[PDB]
């Protein structure tokens, strides 16, 4: 019974809408534009992870460092608790030493 | 629930179809069905030895009956046929006993003659 008895409504995808059609444009902004701009400057997203990557602990540390003062109170409390938990887990748990 | 299983119906049915002829809830409930289906398949796999073993026992019983009809014992029949270089196997000898009694009579007479 864990199965739907009707076909789901058809999902139509426009492969040639503007977003898909122009996807990838300016990814070579650096090597084709005399390196005035780095391609990572094209990234739109959270201010604390534009052109940067890390595990959950590093992401949380960076978020606290960069926008911690602007965070809501309980969100910041949750982030502090999460950093503490992730520190304990990554530095004290695991199969490997 | 980013990724959820949608095939569980078919995964369950693959086992339930083999369980459909069981007794009780073993034919309906997957938790019980899967255990009995595994046992059924293991029995099926192991029974290919017993089929061969029982067929030879059946052939030997039938040959013993047919040869006792002619006063021979099965060891005498088999051994003397071997000594006469007749390489008929037990399946064929049982078939001859059932369906060609005169041929089996000839074989029994030959075995007794060889013995004598």
């Amino acid at each position: 019974i864990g199965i739907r008895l009707t076909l789901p409504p058809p999902k139509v995808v426009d492969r040639w809408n503007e977003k898909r059609a122009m996807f990838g444009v300016y990814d070579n902004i650096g090597i084709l534009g005399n390196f005035e701009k780095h391609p990572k400057e094209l990234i739109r997203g959270p201010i604390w992870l534009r052109g940067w990557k890390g595990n959950e602990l590093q992401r949380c540390i960076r978020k606290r460092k960069m926008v911690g003062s602007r965070m809501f109170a309980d969100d910041l409390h949750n982030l502090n608790k999460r950093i503490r938990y992730l520190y304990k887990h990554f530095n004290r748990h695991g199969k490997f030493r | 629930l980013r990724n959820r299983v949608t095939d569980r119906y078919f995964r369950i049915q693959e086992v339930l179809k083999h369980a459909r002829h069981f007794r009780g809830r073993k034919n309906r409930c997957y938790r019980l069905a899967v255990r009995t289906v595994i046992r059924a398949f293991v029995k099926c796999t192991k029974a290919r030895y017993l089929k061969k073993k029982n067929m030879r026992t059946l052939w030997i019983n039938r040959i013993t009956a047919a040869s006792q009809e002619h006063g021979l014992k099965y060891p005498a029949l088999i051994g003397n046929l071997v000594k006469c270089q007749v390489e008929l196997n037990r399946k064929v000898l049982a078939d001859l006993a059932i369906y060609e009694p005169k041929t089996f009579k000839s074989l029994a007479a030959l075995a007794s003659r060889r013995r004598h």
Binding site: - | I38, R39, F41, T103
Partner: protein, 101 residues
């Protein structure tokens, strides 16, 4: 194996024979030939001059799926395999004997 055979009989070999369907064949290892009133016994084989048993490849099939399951309790040991064996159905067309005794 040894097959007890007569004309028009069907025989199921549990392997492929490298023969096209409808192809005629001579079964060369005849151990026994018998009639209502007499039988001939090879020691262990009858001669080619005496008997001629001919068959025809009627079918080339696979067997029904056979399950091989292994299970050992309390060892997380469970394995399943499905095997289909090639098969050939032969029809025995004729048995001929010759007066070469």
């Amino acid at each position: 194996r040894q097959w007890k055979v007569t004309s028009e009989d069907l025989i199921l070999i549990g392997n492929e024979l490298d023969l096209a369907c409808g192809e005629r064949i001579r079964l060369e290892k005849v151990l026994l030939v018998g009639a209502d009133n007499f039988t001939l016994l090879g020691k262990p084989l009858l001669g080619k001059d005496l008997v001629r048993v001919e068959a025809t490849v009627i079918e080339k099939t696979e067997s029904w799926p056979r399950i091989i399951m292994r299970f050992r309790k309390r060892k997380n040991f469970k394995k399943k395999r499905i095997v289909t064996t090639p098969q050939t159905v032969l029809r025995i067309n004729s048995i001929e004997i010759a007066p070469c005794l």
